[PDB]
Short mmCIF file of C-alpha atoms and ligand atoms in Angstrom, two decimals:
data_model
loop_
_atom_site.label_atom_id
_atom_site.label_comp_id
_atom_site.label_asym_id
_atom_site.label_seq_id
_atom_site.Cartn_x
_atom_site.Cartn_y
_atom_site.Cartn_z
CA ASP A 6 1.18 -10.31 10.02
CA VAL A 7 -0.78 -10.46 6.77
CA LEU A 8 -0.11 -13.56 4.67
CA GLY A 9 -0.53 -13.13 0.96
CA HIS A 10 -1.54 -9.72 -0.34
CA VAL A 11 -3.18 -7.01 1.76
CA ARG A 12 -6.80 -6.76 0.61
CA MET A 13 -9.55 -4.31 1.49
CA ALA A 14 -12.50 -5.44 3.58
CA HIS A 15 -15.73 -5.09 1.64
CA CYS A 16 -19.39 -6.08 1.26
CA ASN A 17 -21.13 -7.58 -1.81
CA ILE A 18 -24.72 -6.38 -2.41
CA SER A 19 -26.56 -7.45 -5.57
CA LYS A 20 -27.43 -4.32 -7.55
CA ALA A 21 -30.75 -5.57 -8.96
CA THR A 22 -32.13 -6.77 -5.63
CA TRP A 23 -31.17 -3.54 -3.89
CA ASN A 24 -32.66 -1.42 -6.68
CA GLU A 25 -35.94 -3.32 -6.39
CA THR A 26 -35.83 -2.95 -2.60
CA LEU A 27 -35.49 0.80 -2.86
CA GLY A 28 -38.23 0.97 -5.48
CA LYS A 29 -40.57 -0.70 -2.99
CA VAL A 30 -39.44 1.66 -0.22
CA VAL A 31 -40.02 4.67 -2.46
CA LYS A 32 -43.56 3.52 -3.28
CA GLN A 33 -44.33 3.20 0.41
CA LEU A 34 -42.75 6.59 1.17
CA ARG A 35 -44.80 8.19 -1.61
CA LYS A 36 -47.92 6.90 0.13
CA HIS A 37 -47.05 9.29 3.03
CA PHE A 38 -45.28 12.16 1.21
CA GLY A 39 -47.38 12.50 -1.98
CA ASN A 40 -47.65 10.60 -5.25
CA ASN A 41 -46.08 13.47 -7.26
CA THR A 42 -43.03 14.19 -5.08
CA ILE A 43 -39.43 13.22 -5.88
CA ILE A 44 -37.63 11.00 -3.35
CA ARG A 45 -33.84 11.17 -3.15
CA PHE A 46 -31.38 9.01 -1.23
CA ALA A 47 -27.99 10.37 -0.17
CA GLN A 48 -25.02 9.41 1.97
CA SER A 49 -24.91 10.23 5.68
CA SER A 50 -24.07 13.90 6.17
CA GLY A 51 -21.72 13.60 9.14
CA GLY A 52 -20.91 12.55 12.67
CA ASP A 53 -18.92 9.73 14.20
CA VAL B 10 12.95 8.91 -14.80
CA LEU B 11 14.73 6.20 -12.87
CA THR B 12 18.39 6.72 -13.95
CA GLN B 13 20.70 3.70 -14.37
CA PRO B 14 24.50 3.41 -15.03
CA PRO B 15 25.43 3.73 -18.76
CA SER B 16 27.32 0.38 -18.48
CA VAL B 17 29.20 -1.61 -15.88
CA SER B 18 32.38 -3.67 -15.47
CA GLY B 19 32.94 -6.73 -13.31
CA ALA B 20 34.95 -9.87 -12.71
CA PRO B 21 34.44 -13.42 -11.39
CA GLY B 22 34.59 -13.49 -7.60
CA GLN B 23 33.85 -9.77 -7.13
CA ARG B 24 30.42 -8.27 -6.59
CA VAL B 25 28.96 -6.21 -9.44
CA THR B 26 26.25 -3.65 -8.68
CA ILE B 27 23.74 -1.77 -10.83
CA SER B 28 22.01 1.30 -9.40
CA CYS B 29 18.72 3.09 -10.05
CA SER B 30 17.99 6.62 -8.84
CA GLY B 31 14.52 8.16 -8.93
CA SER B 32 12.41 10.24 -6.56
CA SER B 33 9.86 9.86 -3.77
CA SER B 34 7.07 9.57 -6.37
CA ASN B 35 8.43 6.50 -8.22
CA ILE B 36 11.02 4.51 -6.21
CA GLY B 37 10.59 5.88 -2.69
CA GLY B 38 6.91 4.92 -2.50
CA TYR B 39 6.66 1.89 -4.82
CA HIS B 40 8.24 -1.50 -5.39
CA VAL B 41 11.10 -1.70 -7.89
CA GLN B 42 11.28 -4.78 -10.12
CA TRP B 43 14.55 -6.00 -11.68
CA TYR B 44 14.81 -7.50 -15.19
CA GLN B 45 17.60 -9.14 -17.21
CA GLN B 46 17.62 -9.63 -21.00
CA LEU B 47 19.96 -10.84 -23.74
CA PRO B 48 19.84 -9.42 -27.31
CA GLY B 49 17.14 -11.08 -29.40
CA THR B 50 15.31 -12.52 -26.36
CA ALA B 51 12.44 -11.13 -24.33
CA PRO B 52 13.34 -9.94 -20.82
CA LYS B 53 12.62 -12.08 -17.79
CA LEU B 54 12.40 -10.64 -14.31
CA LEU B 55 14.94 -11.43 -11.63
CA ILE B 56 13.29 -9.69 -8.69
CA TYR B 57 9.51 -9.06 -8.52
CA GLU B 58 9.39 -7.03 -5.24
CA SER B 59 12.18 -4.78 -4.03
CA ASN B 60 13.65 -7.86 -2.25
CA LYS B 61 11.79 -11.00 -3.40
CA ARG B 62 12.93 -13.33 -6.22
CA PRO B 63 11.08 -16.04 -8.19
CA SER B 64 11.83 -19.65 -7.33
CA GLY B 65 13.43 -20.01 -10.79
CA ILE B 66 16.21 -17.44 -10.19
CA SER B 67 19.55 -18.46 -8.69
CA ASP B 68 21.04 -17.00 -5.50
CA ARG B 69 23.72 -15.04 -7.39
CA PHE B 70 21.28 -12.10 -7.74
CA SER B 71 19.89 -9.97 -4.91
CA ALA B 72 18.76 -6.38 -4.46
CA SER B 73 17.85 -3.72 -1.94
CA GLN B 74 16.18 -0.31 -1.90
CA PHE B 75 16.83 2.72 0.29
CA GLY B 76 15.28 6.16 0.08
CA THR B 77 14.75 7.13 -3.53
CA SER B 78 17.44 4.77 -4.90
CA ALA B 79 17.84 1.03 -5.36
CA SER B 80 20.63 -1.40 -6.17
CA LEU B 81 20.93 -4.85 -7.76
CA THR B 82 23.91 -6.93 -6.59
CA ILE B 83 25.46 -9.84 -8.49
CA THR B 84 27.62 -12.01 -6.23
CA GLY B 85 30.12 -12.76 -9.02
CA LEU B 86 30.28 -12.30 -12.78
CA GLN B 87 29.90 -15.49 -14.83
CA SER B 88 30.50 -15.57 -18.56
CA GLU B 89 26.82 -16.49 -19.02
CA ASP B 90 25.64 -13.60 -16.80
CA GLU B 91 26.52 -10.60 -18.98
CA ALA B 92 23.25 -9.01 -20.04
CA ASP B 93 21.23 -5.81 -20.37
CA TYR B 94 19.64 -5.02 -16.98
CA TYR B 95 16.55 -2.88 -16.37
CA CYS B 96 14.63 -1.63 -13.34
CA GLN B 97 10.92 -0.73 -13.35
CA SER B 98 8.63 1.10 -10.97
CA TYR B 99 5.30 2.92 -10.94
CA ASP B 100 5.72 6.71 -11.14
CA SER B 101 2.83 8.47 -9.39
CA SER B 102 3.83 11.89 -10.77
CA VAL B 103 3.79 10.66 -14.35
CA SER B 104 0.97 8.22 -13.42
CA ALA B 105 2.60 5.52 -15.52
CA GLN B 106 4.99 2.64 -15.10
CA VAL B 107 8.51 3.90 -15.80
CA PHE B 108 11.58 2.04 -17.07
CA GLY B 109 15.14 3.09 -16.49
CA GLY B 110 17.36 3.34 -19.52
CA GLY B 111 19.17 0.17 -18.44
CA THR B 112 22.82 -0.82 -18.26
CA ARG B 113 24.95 -3.12 -20.40
CA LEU B 114 27.09 -5.56 -18.43
CA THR B 115 30.38 -6.75 -19.96
CA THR C 23 4.14 6.31 22.83
CA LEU C 24 4.19 4.27 19.63
CA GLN C 25 6.84 4.61 16.92
CA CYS C 26 5.13 3.68 13.66
CA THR C 27 5.76 3.36 9.95
CA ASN C 28 3.27 2.35 7.30
CA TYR C 29 2.72 -1.36 6.74
CA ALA C 30 3.53 -2.37 3.16
CA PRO C 31 4.54 1.24 2.37
CA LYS C 32 5.33 0.37 -1.26
CA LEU C 33 2.01 -1.39 -1.93
CA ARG C 34 -0.35 -0.12 -4.61
CA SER C 35 -3.87 -0.61 -3.25
CA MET C 36 -6.78 1.16 -1.69
CA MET C 37 -5.20 0.04 1.61
CA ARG C 38 -2.13 2.25 1.28
CA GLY C 39 -1.36 3.51 4.77
CA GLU C 40 -4.41 1.84 6.32
CA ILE C 41 -2.25 -0.53 8.40
CA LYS C 42 0.62 0.89 10.46
CA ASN C 43 3.55 -1.12 11.84
CA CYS C 44 4.08 0.24 15.36
CA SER C 45 6.85 -0.44 17.89
CA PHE C 46 6.52 0.06 21.65
CA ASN C 47 8.12 -1.03 24.96
CA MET C 48 5.02 -2.05 27.00
CA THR C 49 6.15 -4.39 29.86
CA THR C 50 6.13 -8.09 30.81
CA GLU C 51 5.62 -10.66 33.55
CA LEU C 52 8.32 -9.08 35.73
CA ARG C 53 7.95 -5.41 36.67
CA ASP C 54 11.70 -4.74 36.26
CA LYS C 55 11.84 -5.71 32.55
CA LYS C 56 10.18 -4.57 29.33
CA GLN C 57 9.49 -6.53 26.13
CA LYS C 58 9.72 -4.55 22.90
CA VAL C 59 6.69 -5.31 20.72
CA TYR C 60 6.06 -4.83 17.00
CA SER C 61 2.39 -4.95 16.01
CA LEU C 62 0.05 -3.85 13.25
CA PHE C 63 -2.82 -1.43 13.90
CA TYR C 64 -5.43 0.00 11.58
CA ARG C 65 -5.15 3.70 10.76
CA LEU C 66 -8.47 4.37 12.50
CA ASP C 67 -7.13 3.10 15.85
CA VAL C 68 -3.88 5.12 15.87
CA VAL C 69 -3.64 8.94 16.00
CA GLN C 70 -0.50 11.02 15.47
CA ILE C 71 0.97 12.79 18.50
CA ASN C 72 9.24 6.51 12.41
CA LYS C 73 6.55 8.93 13.59
CA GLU C 74 5.09 9.14 17.09
CA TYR C 75 1.51 7.92 17.51
CA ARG C 76 -0.82 6.96 20.35
CA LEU C 77 -3.93 4.80 20.45
CA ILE C 78 -7.01 6.85 19.59
CA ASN C 79 -8.68 6.04 22.92
CA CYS C 80 -5.84 7.02 25.30
CA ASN C 81 -7.15 10.61 25.24
CA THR C 82 -10.71 9.53 26.19
CA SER C 83 -10.97 6.32 28.22
CA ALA C 84 -9.52 3.10 29.55
CA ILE C 85 -9.36 0.17 27.13
CA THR C 86 -10.46 -3.32 28.22
CA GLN C 87 -9.52 -6.29 26.04
CA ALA C 88 -12.42 -8.56 25.19
CA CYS C 89 -11.84 -12.16 26.17
CA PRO C 90 -10.76 -14.10 23.02
CA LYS C 91 -12.76 -17.15 24.20
CA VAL C 92 -16.17 -15.40 24.29
CA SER C 93 -18.02 -15.25 20.97
CA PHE C 94 -19.74 -12.08 19.73
CA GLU C 95 -22.20 -14.03 17.56
CA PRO C 96 -25.80 -12.92 18.33
CA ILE C 97 -27.86 -15.62 20.06
CA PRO C 98 -31.70 -15.42 20.19
CA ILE C 99 -32.99 -14.05 23.49
CA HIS C 100 -36.63 -14.50 24.51
CA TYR C 101 -38.36 -12.18 26.97
CA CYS C 102 -40.89 -13.81 29.29
CA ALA C 103 -43.36 -12.02 31.52
CA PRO C 104 -43.39 -12.75 35.26
CA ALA C 105 -46.49 -14.40 36.67
CA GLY C 106 -49.40 -11.97 36.84
CA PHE C 107 -48.45 -10.27 33.53
CA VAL D 12 1.66 -20.21 -18.20
CA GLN D 13 2.40 -19.33 -21.83
CA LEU D 14 1.75 -16.22 -23.90
CA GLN D 15 1.81 -16.02 -27.70
CA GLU D 16 2.01 -12.60 -29.37
CA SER D 17 0.69 -12.07 -32.89
CA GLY D 18 0.37 -9.12 -35.25
CA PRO D 19 1.24 -7.28 -38.47
CA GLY D 20 4.80 -7.15 -39.73
CA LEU D 21 5.27 -4.04 -41.90
CA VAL D 22 2.59 -1.36 -41.39
CA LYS D 23 2.71 1.64 -43.68
CA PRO D 24 2.97 5.16 -42.16
CA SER D 25 -0.36 6.56 -40.87
CA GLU D 26 -1.97 3.09 -41.00
CA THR D 27 -3.41 1.36 -37.95
CA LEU D 28 -1.29 -1.24 -36.14
CA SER D 29 -3.23 -3.91 -34.23
CA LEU D 30 -1.66 -6.68 -32.13
CA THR D 31 -3.23 -9.50 -30.09
CA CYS D 32 -1.82 -11.73 -27.34
CA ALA D 33 -3.26 -15.09 -26.26
CA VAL D 34 -2.51 -16.88 -22.98
CA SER D 35 -2.96 -20.48 -21.85
CA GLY D 36 -3.02 -21.51 -18.18
CA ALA D 37 -3.36 -18.06 -16.59
CA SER D 38 -6.98 -17.08 -16.02
CA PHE D 39 -7.37 -13.85 -17.96
CA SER D 40 -9.73 -12.20 -15.45
CA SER D 41 -7.40 -12.66 -12.45
CA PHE D 42 -4.48 -10.46 -13.63
CA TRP D 43 -3.50 -7.05 -14.96
CA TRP D 44 -1.91 -7.35 -18.40
CA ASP D 45 0.23 -4.76 -20.19
CA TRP D 46 2.11 -3.93 -23.39
CA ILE D 47 5.80 -3.05 -23.43
CA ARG D 48 7.98 -2.25 -26.45
CA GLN D 49 11.61 -1.62 -27.29
CA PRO D 50 13.43 -0.77 -30.53
CA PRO D 51 16.44 -3.03 -31.07
CA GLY D 52 19.44 -1.41 -29.44
CA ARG D 53 17.23 0.79 -27.21
CA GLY D 54 15.58 0.50 -23.82
CA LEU D 55 12.01 -0.42 -22.99
CA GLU D 56 8.90 1.78 -22.88
CA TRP D 57 5.63 0.90 -21.13
CA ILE D 58 2.52 1.39 -23.30
CA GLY D 59 -0.47 0.68 -21.05
CA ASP D 60 -2.44 -1.96 -19.22
CA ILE D 61 -5.85 -3.61 -18.64
CA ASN D 62 -7.72 -4.69 -15.52
CA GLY D 63 -8.63 -8.26 -16.48
CA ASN D 64 -11.99 -7.98 -14.67
CA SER D 65 -13.35 -4.45 -15.12
CA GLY D 66 -11.84 -3.51 -18.48
CA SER D 67 -10.24 -0.39 -16.95
CA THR D 68 -7.21 0.94 -18.81
CA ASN D 69 -4.04 2.90 -18.19
CA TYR D 70 -1.85 4.54 -20.84
CA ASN D 71 1.58 6.14 -21.01
CA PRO D 72 0.91 9.95 -21.16
CA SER D 73 3.39 10.34 -24.05
CA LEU D 74 1.46 7.80 -26.18
CA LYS D 75 -2.12 8.10 -24.80
CA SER D 76 -3.68 10.12 -27.63
CA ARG D 77 -2.69 7.47 -30.22
CA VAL D 78 -3.12 4.23 -28.21
CA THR D 79 -6.18 2.17 -27.28
CA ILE D 80 -5.90 -1.12 -25.36
CA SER D 81 -8.81 -3.56 -25.12
CA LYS D 82 -9.52 -7.08 -23.89
CA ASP D 83 -11.86 -9.98 -24.50
CA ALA D 84 -12.21 -12.51 -21.70
CA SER D 85 -13.59 -14.97 -24.24
CA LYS D 86 -10.66 -16.82 -25.82
CA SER D 87 -8.38 -15.14 -23.21
CA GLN D 88 -7.21 -12.37 -25.57
CA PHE D 89 -5.53 -9.01 -25.01
CA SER D 90 -5.29 -6.42 -27.85
CA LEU D 91 -3.43 -3.18 -28.63
CA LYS D 92 -4.50 -0.66 -31.30
CA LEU D 93 -2.00 2.06 -32.29
CA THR D 94 -2.69 4.78 -34.87
CA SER D 95 -0.57 7.39 -36.67
CA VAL D 96 2.41 5.03 -36.67
CA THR D 97 5.81 6.24 -37.89
CA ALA D 98 9.20 4.59 -38.32
CA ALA D 99 10.51 6.65 -35.40
CA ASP D 100 7.91 4.98 -33.13
CA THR D 101 8.22 1.31 -34.17
CA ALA D 102 9.65 -1.44 -31.97
CA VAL D 103 9.64 -5.05 -30.90
CA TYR D 104 6.32 -5.47 -29.08
CA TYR D 105 5.78 -7.72 -26.06
CA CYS D 106 2.95 -8.67 -23.73
CA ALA D 107 3.51 -9.67 -20.14
CA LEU D 108 1.56 -10.48 -17.03
CA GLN D 109 1.79 -7.31 -14.96
CA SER D 110 0.04 -7.91 -11.64
CA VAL D 111 -2.80 -9.54 -9.69
CA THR D 112 -6.20 -7.80 -9.82
CA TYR D 113 -8.97 -8.25 -7.27
CA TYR D 114 -12.66 -7.57 -7.76
CA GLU D 115 -12.84 -5.34 -4.66
CA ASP D 116 -10.03 -2.98 -5.75
CA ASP D 117 -9.87 -1.69 -9.32
CA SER D 118 -6.50 0.02 -8.63
CA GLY D 119 -4.83 -2.98 -6.96
CA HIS D 120 -1.81 -3.69 -9.20
CA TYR D 121 -0.65 -6.27 -6.66
CA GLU D 122 2.92 -7.54 -7.06
CA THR D 123 3.34 -11.22 -7.89
CA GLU D 124 5.87 -13.80 -9.04
CA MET D 125 3.53 -14.51 -11.97
CA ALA D 126 4.73 -11.27 -13.61
CA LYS D 127 7.73 -13.28 -14.88
CA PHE D 128 5.54 -14.89 -17.60
CA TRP D 129 6.67 -12.83 -20.58
CA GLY D 130 6.19 -13.85 -24.20
CA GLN D 131 8.90 -13.66 -26.84
CA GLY D 132 7.45 -10.71 -28.76
CA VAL D 133 7.15 -9.72 -32.41
CA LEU D 134 9.08 -7.17 -34.48
CA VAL D 135 6.91 -4.42 -36.01
CA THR D 136 8.32 -2.20 -38.76
CA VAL D 137 7.06 1.00 -40.37
CA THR E 3 7.71 13.25 46.69
CA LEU E 4 6.66 16.90 46.59
CA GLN E 5 9.10 19.82 46.45
CA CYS E 6 7.36 22.72 48.16
CA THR E 7 7.87 26.33 49.15
CA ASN E 8 5.42 28.55 50.99
CA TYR E 9 2.74 30.28 48.95
CA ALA E 10 2.95 34.06 49.29
CA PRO E 11 6.01 33.68 51.57
CA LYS E 12 6.29 37.46 52.04
CA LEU E 13 2.63 37.97 53.01
CA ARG E 14 1.69 39.41 56.39
CA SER E 15 -1.46 37.58 57.49
CA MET E 16 -2.75 34.87 59.74
CA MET E 17 -2.37 32.65 56.65
CA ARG E 18 1.43 32.83 56.57
CA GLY E 19 2.63 29.38 55.54
CA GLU E 20 -0.89 27.91 55.46
CA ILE E 21 -0.75 27.37 51.68
CA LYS E 22 2.27 25.63 50.16
CA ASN E 23 3.26 25.77 46.48
CA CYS E 24 4.34 22.20 45.63
CA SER E 25 5.96 20.78 42.49
CA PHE E 26 5.81 17.12 41.45
CA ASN E 27 6.22 14.88 38.36
CA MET E 28 3.04 12.72 38.56
CA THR E 29 2.35 11.23 35.07
CA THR E 30 0.01 11.72 32.07
CA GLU E 31 -2.12 10.06 29.41
CA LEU E 32 0.86 8.12 28.05
CA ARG E 33 2.78 5.85 30.43
CA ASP E 34 6.16 6.82 28.92
CA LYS E 35 5.88 10.55 29.73
CA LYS E 36 5.44 12.68 32.85
CA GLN E 37 3.86 16.13 33.22
CA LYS E 38 5.43 18.39 35.84
CA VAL E 39 2.70 19.96 37.98
CA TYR E 40 2.69 23.00 40.25
CA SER E 41 -0.22 23.13 42.70
CA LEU E 42 -1.24 24.71 45.99
CA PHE E 43 -2.05 22.60 49.05
CA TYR E 44 -3.10 23.60 52.53
CA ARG E 45 -0.57 23.05 55.31
CA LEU E 46 -2.87 20.49 56.95
CA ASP E 47 -2.77 18.22 53.87
CA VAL E 48 1.03 18.20 53.41
CA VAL E 49 3.56 16.74 55.89
CA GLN E 50 7.34 17.16 55.76
C1 NAG F 219 -23.45 -14.48 -1.72
O1 NAG F 219 -23.05 -15.86 -1.79
C2 NAG F 219 -23.93 -16.70 -2.56
C3 NAG F 219 -23.39 -18.11 -2.46
O2 NAG F 219 -24.00 -18.96 -3.42
C4 NAG F 219 -23.98 -16.18 -3.99
O3 NAG F 219 -24.86 -16.99 -4.76
C5 NAG F 219 -24.45 -14.74 -3.99
O4 NAG F 219 -24.47 -14.23 -5.31
C6 NAG F 219 -23.51 -13.90 -3.14
N1 NAG F 219 -23.94 -12.51 -3.11
C7 NAG F 219 -23.51 -11.60 -3.99
C8 NAG F 219 -24.05 -10.21 -3.81
O5 NAG F 219 -22.71 -11.87 -4.88
C1 NAG F 220 11.81 1.76 24.58
O1 NAG F 220 12.52 2.21 25.75
C2 NAG F 220 13.91 2.52 25.53
C3 NAG F 220 14.49 2.90 26.87
O2 NAG F 220 15.90 3.07 26.79
C4 NAG F 220 14.01 3.63 24.49
O3 NAG F 220 15.38 3.91 24.23
C5 NAG F 220 13.32 3.18 23.21
O4 NAG F 220 13.38 4.21 22.23
C6 NAG F 220 11.87 2.84 23.51
N1 NAG F 220 11.18 2.42 22.30
C7 NAG F 220 9.92 2.75 22.01
C8 NAG F 220 9.38 2.22 20.72
O5 NAG F 220 9.24 3.45 22.76
C1 NAG F 221 -9.45 13.94 22.55
O1 NAG F 221 -10.57 14.08 23.44
C2 NAG F 221 -11.35 15.27 23.20
C3 NAG F 221 -12.44 15.30 24.24
O2 NAG F 221 -13.42 16.28 23.93
C4 NAG F 221 -11.89 15.25 21.77
O3 NAG F 221 -12.62 16.44 21.52
C5 NAG F 221 -10.72 15.14 20.80
O4 NAG F 221 -11.20 15.07 19.46
C6 NAG F 221 -9.94 13.88 21.11
N1 NAG F 221 -8.83 13.72 20.19
C7 NAG F 221 -8.91 13.00 19.06
C8 NAG F 221 -7.67 12.94 18.23
O5 NAG F 221 -9.94 12.42 18.73
C1 NAG F 222 10.86 15.03 38.36
O1 NAG F 222 11.63 13.96 37.77
C2 NAG F 222 12.92 14.36 37.28
C3 NAG F 222 13.55 13.14 36.65
O2 NAG F 222 14.77 13.46 35.99
C4 NAG F 222 13.75 14.92 38.44
O3 NAG F 222 15.01 15.36 37.95
C5 NAG F 222 12.99 16.09 39.06
O4 NAG F 222 13.73 16.61 40.16
C6 NAG F 222 11.63 15.62 39.53
N1 NAG F 222 10.89 16.71 40.14
C7 NAG F 222 10.12 16.57 41.22
C8 NAG F 222 9.44 17.81 41.71
O5 NAG F 222 9.97 15.49 41.78
#
């Protein structure tokens, strides 16, 4: 049984910390892929 | 969209029922709340889920839902119980909460 | 074969249909009797086949229940070389 | 929990009608709040609601183009702004607690006993 | 228990009765259902 209301499982990630984390990752990726390229992040395309 | 009886008779000692009839998009898939009001006073709810009542409501009122219809049962008409009754539910076709037109109990 | 309906079918939420209330016969301590069971399963564990459903894995493999007394919390493991390495 | 409605009495045709509701012991951010109205002698019509956390709104499609609902967590206040008002569309206006809202689900509308906490309403004329 | 008839019962050959066409209930993926099966077995694997 579920006591109380049925609530969705979820994760809390601070937006500012994550944004800074990706900015750092992008800088390090640019070091290998070129300073003038555009780096894009996207959701997983498929599979299990 | 949820229809209700135009009015409704009753007597002490006999059950009195009020019906609502909707569709699969408003009653069949959503909880139906029941409300009771007197003229000049704001409504209060009697039933907040299709079956569950607040702790402040007496045992004379109960309700059930089946299919696309629902019914409120009063176990016996008291002189203090006559009132205007309403049912409410969320209508996913309209995408709004919908009231029935209500019934007047005498 | 499971006979299932949605859990909290009238609930407004993101979890609308995510939990199914399934009924099945299973069995019990004595081989001659069966105990009807009502249980809740997540949508992702139950696949259609009251509606009839089966567990998602019955088409692929045997299911072993993990012991409820053994924790899944990661514990640090150290790797040590044998003498000579 | 208490709720006190307040607003204009007679509003001339085509003027803006603006009502505010204040609550006491119910944390504003934990519930969905809505507006409901009824003319005397007539049934009730739902106007719209607010997600006490996100500020998200819902409106009755028959009213939507003329109705804006807003909230302010500070001072625990809920407001309704209606334009192009006519006598045909006036009513007694009420606020009520509608449902429980959770931060993880902006469409929750979770049923609760607390929805019984209705105010007494005000009569608006046009 | 298998219910069997001879395979190719009208065949003239040395293999006359060597293969039997057997029917049985067995079972299937779900414990509540059974799948009737028709299969061929050699005489030496099946005993009356
Ligand atoms: C996780 O919990 C801590 C507890 O203090 C809280 O400060 C932090 O903000 C939480 N994380 C997020 C993303 O809210
Ligand atoms: C359990 O077994 C009985 C056997 O008579 C059957 O009638 C019933 O429908 C079964 N229920 C389920 C959920 O499989
Ligand atoms: C059943 O197993 C097969 C094995 O290849 C798989 O392809 C199929 O998707 C499975 N069924 C479901 C519902 O996952
Ligand atoms: C299979 O089981 C059914 C059960 O009703 C029975 O009638 C049938 O004769 C069985 N067939 C074989 C080949 O055992």
